[PDB]
Design an enzyme around this catalytic site. Structure first.
Site, PDB file in Angstrom:
ATOM      1  N   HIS A  72       0.785  -1.243   0.000  1.00 56.51           N
ATOM      2  CA  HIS A  72       0.000   0.000   0.000  1.00 56.51           C
ATOM      3  C   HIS A  72       0.826   1.308   0.000  1.00 56.51           C
ATOM      4  CE1 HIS A  72      -0.520  -2.725   3.443  1.00 56.51           C
ATOM      5  NE2 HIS A  72      -0.611  -1.718   4.299  1.00 56.51           N
ATOM      6  N   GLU A 131       1.373  -8.858  -0.819  1.00 57.71           N
ATOM      7  CA  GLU A 131       1.192  -7.597  -0.086  1.00 57.71           C
ATOM      8  C   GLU A 131       2.482  -6.943   0.356  1.00 57.71           C
ATOM      9  OE1 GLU A 131      -1.810  -6.349  -0.513  1.00 57.71           O
ATOM     10  OE2 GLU A 131      -1.689  -4.554   0.751  1.00 57.71           O
ATOM     11  N   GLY A 177      -1.938   2.931   9.761  1.00 58.55           N
ATOM     12  CA  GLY A 177      -0.797   3.721  10.252  1.00 58.55           C
ATOM     13  C   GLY A 177       0.299   2.843  10.843  1.00 58.55           C
ATOM     14  N   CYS A 195       0.726   0.137   9.378  1.00 60.60           N
ATOM     15  CA  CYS A 195       1.130  -0.491   8.123  1.00 60.60           C
ATOM     16  C   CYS A 195       2.592  -0.242   7.895  1.00 60.60           C
ATOM     17  CB  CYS A 195       0.283  -0.008   6.948  1.00 60.60           C
ATOM     18  SG  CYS A 195      -1.262  -0.945   6.910  1.00 60.60           S
TER      19      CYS A 195
END
Lengths: 181, 181
Positions: free
Chosen positions: A41, A72, A146, A148
């Site tokens: 992300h 991911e 956050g 992350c």
């Protein structure tokens, strides 16, 4: 928990940085040479801020398995003239389970912060915001965005990178030795 | 650091809660009976949210020393029908110095998070946003608001409550035994 915290503090001081992309602020772990990892992300562009300094990005690879399934994680190669301390020896060959783990975050919204998360189990397959995803590790985690990019560790082991949660559990992408080189 | 982290996790699980006042979200430490402490900036009103539940506030005392000097702490008496686990034995008679401390935060913006801060020294007198303040402890801390209320601990010791910082150091109000009863 205590040995996992001491391990995590040391490892974060040596190998972590705070990264800013156009998509947000993230914890980044340098792995070896000029290769680091981000949660997918983060979407790094051709420049990132690393500890508030501009750094060129030479390559970025969104990882998938042999059949194209999302893992991911984005590996990124940085244009810097230092090497990272090689921590590939702390990365397992396959998904790690542990009884006591710490998640470590290094950002403005969380500077140098550590969360005990308890047991880590191999969850495996999951849907992540619509996307089928594999190699997920799961642990207790009253759940915020956050985190992350947070680095999941236990004594002597770097397990994965925190990539999301559901409110009661958090999920990391397992960070495997073979991803590197 | 490891023993201080294990101590801090245990103590936070037993004696801390997340509090919301009209002025923000804060970590709160229950001390004994129905008495808890907040940083003074929390400004509790007649009701607070404690772990998202409304709780009446029966008394609040903004602490000052014998000569009216600000100590930056508010003691609050809560209308609940449980007692806090008595932790007054973990509170020192006078300002504590230690070589290794952890700051623990329990809020939405920081849930169950721990920061190693290293050495704690008695700073004493300081100006806090214009206000002369005494009994301050100081430690390394790349500095954010929102940590306000964080609980400063070392192995077997509760030292103080985090009340601000300057960008490079953080400051706690020393949490002294005699404040209670």
């Amino acid at each position: 928990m205590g040995p996992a915290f001491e391990f995590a503090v040391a490892m974060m001081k040596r190998n972590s940085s705070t990264v800013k992309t156009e998509y947000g602020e993230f914890t980044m772990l340098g792995i070896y040479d000029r290769w680091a990892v981000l949660p997918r992300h983060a979407k790094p562009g051709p420049t990132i801020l690393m500890n508030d300094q501009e750094v060129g990005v030479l390559d970025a690879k969104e990882l998938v398995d042999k059949d194209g399934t999302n893992l991911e994680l984005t590996l990124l190669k940085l244009n810097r003239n230092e090497k990272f301390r090689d921590i590939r020896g702390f990365l397992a060959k396959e998904e790690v389970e542990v009884n006591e783990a710490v998640l470590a975050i290094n950002t403005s919204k969380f500077p140098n912060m550590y969360i005990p998360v308890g047991q880590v189990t191999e969850y495996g397959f999951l849907y992540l915001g619509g996307t089928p995803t594999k190699r997920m590790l799961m642990y207790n985690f009253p759940t915020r965005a956050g985190q992350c990019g947070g680095v999941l560790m236990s004594t002597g082991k770097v397990l994965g990178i925190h990539v999301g949660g559901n409110g009661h559990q958090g999920f990391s992408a397992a960070l495997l030795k073979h991803y590197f080189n």
